[PDB]
Design a protein around this ligand. Structure first.
Ligand SMILES: CO[C@H]1O[C@H](CO)[C@@H](O)[C@H](O)[C@@H]1O
Lengths: 205, 279
């Protein structure tokens, strides 16, 4: 089908633009590539505009998408803002299967896009450690004090495993705590390159 | 004949070896290129140019660590490229001056589909290149051994997964019928996927997709997708676990479901958007 070069995207505040790769694997089958950027609440506002807004990839191709900053510094400058980029691949209609009952699918890749204010203290590679905790016979409230979005994964209460989490900057995110816990926290995060970071042991606050 | 390193380190006549440290591009995507231009850090000169001519070659070129597992490349030696790792000694270049001129060796490395996250660890041996020297004056044959060490990590961002599927499904199975929809996903690098369907709906339960058609809209029916007997309403993310090198089938079946109370002859065609969510 059609796949994006990244699994996420980081938009550097100030950057005139940011590029993302798109490629069609199907040796023969054209597609219409529509792309847009929804915000955290999934509302298609204008904060970000992608070009080209509409185009075709006849068979194997490999074009570039350009995310354009549209929010004239109208966003939070002390931390990241979460947005969602969607790239939809529209298949052409088969003029042959006209008198037929059909169901045509349309794949869409939806990857996170983080807006990163050009000036931030704590460097990104040094944030997945600032991750503190707080437990209960129920809650295990994650708590990211940094300005970046922590994509917590492989989070285990040591004993029992757990539900992944996306802990917003300087905010928390609760997760159920199914008894089998003890205190041995073991989690891993997904970095700017969509790669897992090293295991780590939960440090309660 | 002698050579010195940009950092100043030298290997006198007779040869020997030295470390050549490099700062490689921090990020390189699959299909993209990693170039280590050594013609910037290795210089050699001819000692008695007026009467002696020097012939310099790329005797061997070996890969190590990251580069050896995460890359496939060529060695461009003086306007010509050859395989890297090298399999044969290259043509000779001449050095005829006491002034340090460059050694035109450059690596063109390309991360593979399977390249990890840190395709090259910082401080690791990236390559060892052997510079050979001879001359038209005597029978001397000396080897200069350059050890290429990477100063930083070379990261190859993980790409999106691939949704293999057989085009436009023929839900022909006359009104009552129901076909299975082939659809799998294979990620070059294991990661957790999540997907949800989107499209216009026709029921309170948001699971029967409206009939979009040109010829006689067989009013009354609609298309509902199920994954192993389980209904998939629109916008209800389904955790696919973690897709890896083995394409997981979503296990979908296009089913006819009724909307209003008056099923009626005609064609039933539908358009559904499947959205894969990345972590
Ligand atoms: C003494 O000769 C040295 O210098 C000449 C001129 O560079 C080289 O050709 C030769 O191989 C030796 O390195």
């Amino acid at each position: 089908g059609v796949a994006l070069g990244a699994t996420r995207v980081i938009y550097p505040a100030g950057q005139k633009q940011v590029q993302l790769a798109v490629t069609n694997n199907d040796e023969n089958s054209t597609y219409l590539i529509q792309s847009w950027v929804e915000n955290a609440d999934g509302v298609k506002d204008g904060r970000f505009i992608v070009t080209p807004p509409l185009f075709a990839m006849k068979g194997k191709k490999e074009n570039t998408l350009r995310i354009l900053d549209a929010t004239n510094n109208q966003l939070p400058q002390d931390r990241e803002s979460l947005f969602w980029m969607n790239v939809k691949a529209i298949p052409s209609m088969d003029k042959s299967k006209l008198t037929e009952n059909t169901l045509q699918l349309a794949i869409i890749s939806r990857i996170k896009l983080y807006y990163r204010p050009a000036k931030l203290a704590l460097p990104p590679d040094q944030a997945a450690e600032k991750l503190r905790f707080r437990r209960s016979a129920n809650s295990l409230t994650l708590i990211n004090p940094t300005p970046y979005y922590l994509t917590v994964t492989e989070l285990n209460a040591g004993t029992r495993v757990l539900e992944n989490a996306l802990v917003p900057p300087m905010g928390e995110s609760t997760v159920k705590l199914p008894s089998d816990a003890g205190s041995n926290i073991t989690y891993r995060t997904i970095n700017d390159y969509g790669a897992l970071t090293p295991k780590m042991t939960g440090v309660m606050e | 004949f002698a050579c010195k390193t940009a950092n100043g380190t030298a290997i006198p006549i007779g040869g020997g070896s030295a470390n050549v440290y490099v700062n490689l591009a921090p990020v390189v995507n699959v299909g993209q290129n990693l170039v280590v231009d050594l013609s910037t850090q290795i210089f050699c000169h001819n000692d008695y140019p007026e009467t002696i001519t020097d012939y310099v070659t790329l005797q061997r070129g070996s890969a190590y660590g990251g580069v050896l597992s995460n890359f496939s490349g060529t060695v461009k030696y003086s306007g010509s490229s050859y395989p890297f790792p090298t399999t044969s000694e290259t043509p000779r270049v001449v050095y005829n001056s006491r002034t340090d001129k460059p050694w035109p060796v450059a690596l063109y490395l390309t991360p593979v589909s399977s390249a990890g996250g840190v395709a090259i660890k910082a401080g690791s041996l990236i390559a060892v290149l052997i510079l050979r020297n001879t001359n038209n004056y005597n029978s001397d044959d000396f080897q200069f051994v350059w050890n290429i060490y990477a100063n930083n990590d070379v990261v190859v961002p993980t790409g999106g997964c691939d949704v293999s599927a057989r085009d436009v499904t023929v839900t022909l199975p006359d009104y009552p019928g129901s076909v299975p929809i082939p659809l799998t996903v294979y990620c070059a690098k294991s990661q957790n996927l999540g997907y949800y369907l989107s499209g216009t709906t026709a029921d309170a339960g948001n699971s029967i997709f409206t009939n979009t058609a040109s010829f006689s809209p067989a009013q009354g029916v609609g298309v509902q997708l199920t994954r192993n007997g389980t209904i998939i309403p629109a916008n209800n993310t389904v955790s696919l676990g973690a897709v890896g090198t083995s394409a997981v089938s979503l296990g979908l079946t296009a089913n006819y479901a009724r909307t209003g109370g008056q099923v009626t002859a005609g064609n039933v065609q539908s358009i559904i958007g499947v959205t894969f969510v990345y972590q």
